[PDB]
Amino acid sequence: SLSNKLTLDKLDVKGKRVVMRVDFNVPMKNNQITNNQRIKAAVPSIKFCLDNGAKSVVLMSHLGRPDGVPMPDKYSLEPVAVELKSLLGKDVLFLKDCVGPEVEKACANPAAGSVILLENLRFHVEEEGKGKDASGNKVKAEPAKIEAFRASLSKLGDVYVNDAFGTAHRAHSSMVGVNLPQKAGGFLMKKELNYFAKALESPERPFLAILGGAKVADKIQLINNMLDKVNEMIIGGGMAFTFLKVLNNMEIGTSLFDEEGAKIVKDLMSKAEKNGVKITLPVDFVTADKFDENAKTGQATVASGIPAGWMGLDCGPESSKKYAEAVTRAKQIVWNGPVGVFEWEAFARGTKALMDEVVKATSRGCITIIGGDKVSHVSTGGGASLELLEGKVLPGVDALSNI
Secondary structure (H helix, E strand, C coil), X not given: CCCCECEHHHXXXXXXXXXXXXXXXXXXXXXXXXXXXXXXXXXXXXXXXXXXXXXXXXXXCCCCCCCCCCCHHHHXXXXXXXXXXXXXXXXXEEECCCCCHHHHHHHHCCCCCEEXXXXXXXXXXXHHCEEECCCCCEXXXXXXXXXXXXXXXXXXXXXXXXXXXXXXXXXXXXXXXXCCCCEXXXXXXXXXXXXXXXXXXXXXXXXXXXXXXXXXXXXXXXXXXXXXXXXEXXXXXXXXHHHHHHHHCCCECCCCCCHHHHCCHHHHHHHHHHCCCEEECCCEEEEECCCCCCCCEEEEECCCCECCCCEEEEECHHHHHHHHHHHHHCCEEEEECCXXXXXXXXXXXXXXXXXXXXXHHHHCCCEEEECCCCCCXXXXXXXXXXXXXXXXXXXXXXXXXXX
């Protein structure tokens, strides 16, 4: 809901310095960005600010989980400044901190039209307002220091914009603690919330949810919430083996089994039935001799069982056909979590086949929402999308200025 909140479309930014929380928490390997979707997604807000004559746009974000220690060797945002520069066609000034005297001076009166990116907010304990030491023990943030941190962030612009939808579930200093008279929702924040509100409150029907992941127990609220809204649900990925063991006494080898989620499958299925929700579980598998990209591979059905010492790491082809049937009946699809270990090519085919069906569904006019232009909406949300889908509230939205 953004009808009583200040949004960027109505913020006057001409001649003003804009401090903007974004979610540049991008997947990385070897200090290379392996997906820049989160960065591209922030561009329309940035460009609007620049185009309407902002003095500067100061971008701040976290990356990974350094837990309040500066870890520039592992979780620096520097590669993001590079990437961002090429997305924008504008120089981006990268600053090696996010608070303190030097950062404040650099942001005090920048050259007109400047784009500045701060280093990882979570290098400070004060952002999350808790942290960890190098022995793993809980470090407390001092309230006085949390207040100095927020006060420093608040100096870096004249107006605040939150476009960090992927972080909106976190009540962290940069998300709720910035003290400026105008705290406005950005274009991403608005676009994300709009798609999810339309999908959840006014769905096109039949509404299919595709939920994949490793464990059942952490997805109970998610599944329960979805079962009150949808007509159909695919339950895929490794958590499917918990359902199949309990519902069909499938022999699952060494595949994932959620000893606690198992005890509540009966209740999820009962709720599905009372709601007229058709549940589609996988019926066949690509198996592996070990959890390894280069494991030896085999095939199994529910009927054959998976052999001892082997684990299912993708659905197989009959499963992909049954998933395709449910996709073909859908007018709206919300898909959260892969159906197999798609990072490894040997165990990607089910996720790729499913994507194929979803893309074909978009071409037919169906609404397709996929998680953190071939589909209706690729969410940047991640954990925030899961929290929205579990009925929960978003402190990053809540803290915006009222009109």
